[PDB]
Amino acid sequence: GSMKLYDFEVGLDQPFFLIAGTCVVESEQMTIDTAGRLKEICAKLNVPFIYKSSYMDEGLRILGEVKRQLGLPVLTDVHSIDEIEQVASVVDVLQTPAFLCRQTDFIHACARSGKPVNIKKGQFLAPHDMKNVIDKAREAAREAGLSEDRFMACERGVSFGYNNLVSDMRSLAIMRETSAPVVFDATHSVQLPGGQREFVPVLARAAVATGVAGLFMETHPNPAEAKSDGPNAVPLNRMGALLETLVTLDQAVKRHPFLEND
Amino acid sequence: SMKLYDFEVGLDQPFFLIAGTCVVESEQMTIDTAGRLKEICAKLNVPFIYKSSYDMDEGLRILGEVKRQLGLPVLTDVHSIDEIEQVASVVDVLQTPAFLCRQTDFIHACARSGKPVNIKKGQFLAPHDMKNVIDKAREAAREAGLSEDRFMACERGVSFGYNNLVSDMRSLAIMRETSAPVVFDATHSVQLPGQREFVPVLARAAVATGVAGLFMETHPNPAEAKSDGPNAVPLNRMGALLETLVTLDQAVKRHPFLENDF
Amino acid sequence: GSMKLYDFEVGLDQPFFLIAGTCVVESEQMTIDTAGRLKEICAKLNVPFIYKSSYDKMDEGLRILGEVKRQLGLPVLTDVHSIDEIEQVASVVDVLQTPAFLCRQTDFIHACARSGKPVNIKKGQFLAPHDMKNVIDKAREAAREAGLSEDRFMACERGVSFGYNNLVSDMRSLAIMRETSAPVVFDATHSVQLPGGQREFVPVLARAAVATGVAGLFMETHPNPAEAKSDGPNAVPLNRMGALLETLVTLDQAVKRHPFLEND
Amino acid sequence: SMKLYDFEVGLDQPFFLIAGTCVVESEQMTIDTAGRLKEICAKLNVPFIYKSSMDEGLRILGEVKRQLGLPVLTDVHSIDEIEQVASVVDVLQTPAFLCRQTDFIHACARSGKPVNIKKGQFLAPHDMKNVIDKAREAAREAGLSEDRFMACERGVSFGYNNLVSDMRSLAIMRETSAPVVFDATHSVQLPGQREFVPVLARAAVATGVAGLFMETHPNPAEAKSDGPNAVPLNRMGALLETLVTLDQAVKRHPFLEND
């Protein structure tokens, strides 16, 4: 399942794309500044790039400005059914909170919004459960007269005892049965339910070698203020270096079929 | 940056492979399969340690023939203090069952054996718990007049509910604090306390995370290697898998790991 | 921690109350019969009883619940799944109950909190026990903001994720959630769930939970035990409810006769 | 069901208590504390096995056994200790991590003494049947009776640095046809939790078990909430009175789950 997203193609058989945004809220002008830096970093490496909003009316307006000034596709989380219409009018991709993955009214209202949807897998789900979630979203899309190839399955961690998430790299393989692009959320997969930014690169490298369609990471736009006890965000001035590694990994594992298929 | 016979191993070296079979074969076939593995690894310049399929006196004789005929370093599991002399008198590297990782009498008998030891992390340990295991093992070696840089720390999964292990890639980075080479066991990490499909998945993830070494079992009879069989890569696919893994390992070791700078 | 719940008071210092409903939908007439049978089973043992709707997984379901109330006088609880359902179920039901996975969906929980009805708030299987305090405190602020009293919430244990497709019931949670200052309810039916087939553990966990010390207990019952197999819903056969409840009464009395030692 | 020292133990019997101290005492105060536990348990008719808090430890355990006429239990840690330990004690106990180390479990099996086999924190409850079935094969091949083993729940790993007590395990392990023992002190321990010992004890006894292990703190003056996972000695009577009431309640009639 390799689908169209904005003006590029995404999927397990395509070069990985990045979703990134900031771990702090900036002024309008600085939000554009940071988005522009990310655009340039990704452009030089040829990594397809979707900008994610740092946060409602005002947040959406600024996202609209990012889209218009920088020609970027943008993505935001939607939190309730009542928000969908307003958000989907502005953004190119909706993203659902993990804990709502089985709130069928909500997921289906997103599915019929007219925009593609990055569906986060609840931390209480087994990887096989995503197939049901995607199948029912597709049925909602069909019934609204919309194409079915408009969903991604997003791994964000599974509950591991109390106050911890583990990233089971097996999930990234299993969710290929959804026939939907698999997206790895590196920032939320390290979060204790900040202080874990050291594991963002670790998990990103592991996930990209596992084989995914896309990756989400938050970035810290003020490396001067970016500390190990802060958000689980990669400093902006190190993003280039990490992406170069991830491109090499992505190319390596997609040069030939994954053995586990073969 | 540990010396291990003919080569050096470590996070700062190319990864080494420990591999042996998921089935016991006749003596002649055992030598045959060890030979094939030696050549596969030779063509790719992957340092190779052979693991015994017998882990009794008969199995040690056959392992003796493997070493004499092929010159391979040999690794074996040992299960009790008595097996150490019986074995450490024939093999080059000892390996300890994960469930015995805090059985200090046994781990310290291995530490004083005169052979290097790959010490498996218990499925009930947290990654930070390995430092104390290695530190006490090094103490034992020192008290016996042996050098301290003779231990590896081996990740083999952590318990995840009932009848399931999960491979937390964070552990591979955390155990770097042991100043011991970290080894990833891909075959036992997938096991349900029928999962061969996850062996290449976890090997790629672990190699991209950054390890000193990797353990995988191989199936020597690919005509009879099935999905519901052992958690083993068919011998005829090992070369292709190792080529992927070499590419990933070289890629992540080209520069310092980003997480070091956090 | 005590709380008025219509005709009775509930709390760690009161006799436990039961929430029970069927695990299958029955005809209108068997629905009424079954509700009367449960009423009687509980009446004979003096177990305060709240009837749970079988129709909550519409207007018909609500009509029938209306007949249950009008005919039998039972207080009625229902799961609600969206903000819209709150107003829809208002004329019939007495107690709202929230899906576990919505425990942090603030718009939804605060709508429940403002409904005018008390609410049994299920703890998500992704939460740790200490997390429930903030959930309850948020619900109370919403209640306050709407001119409603704050002593109208209960905290319901329904298990926590344990690897894949498995829930474990950490009895420590039932003690820890006392810090919410709200009655703690144990859901013995969804706590055995394998995210049916686990009905053998419903009495096990109900006994354990009541001996741990709770305000309330939710169990489903099966009205047609002869159809009720080991592979079916996680429900106590209706003809065994009396015997189980007599055991649970005895446990509840034993553990509340004196202070809980963990409080010393 | 089976005979243990002087008495019958099992799901169809009044629960027995295994208890020992959370701190090593002097010989005389070890004796006094075992004495006080003995009296507490006798007043309530609770069958009581004392667990030791190597030569010297076994010497003192032998004095407890003899002077107070108590059965005694201790952990064995290697095959090499078995013969020395079994000549002194009435019940062997195996560390949970060793539950699959079959040469070691089977040596305990042939020892001639009964064995309380701890379920490792890495095992699923169904896994104990194979462990116990093999122990029994080892007993039989040695000419000993097969009804000399107990399955002991001590927690299962729950993420990192935490154990959870799945009360389902206590019912599932009934399939072993061996008495199930609940370890309330080790089931709370983080791989400062004494407040959960009474919680888990009440829960396990209501679930239905043959036996219960708890540590007690013999110096309640020094016994703190940040201290061991141990019930102060002066509160054991009150706790045991509650537990007996629960044990009688759930054993009065068959367990509903037995359908």
Residue numbers in the entry:
A (entry chain C): -1 to 53, 69 to 206, 214 to 282
B (entry chain B): 0 to 54, 69 to 206, 215 to 283
C (entry chain A): -1 to 55, 69 to 206, 214 to 282
D (entry chain D): 0 to 52, 69 to 206, 215 to 282
Pull text from the paper.
Here we report a functional and structural genomics effort that applied saturation-level transposon mutagenesis and next generation sequencing (Tn-seq) to identify essential genes in B. thailandensis, followed by high-throughput structure determination. We used an “ortholog rescue” approach to maximize structural coverage of these gene families, which are likely to be essential not only in B. thailandensis, but also in related, but more virulent, Burkholderia species, such as B. pseudomallei.
For the seven pairs of ortholog structures (with no bound ligand) solved in this study, the average overall Cα RMSD was 1.5±0.5 Å, indicating a high degree of structural similarity. This structural similarity suggests that the ortholog approach is an efficient method to obtain useable structures from otherwise intractable targets, thereby lowering the barrier to structure-based drug design targeting infectious organisms.
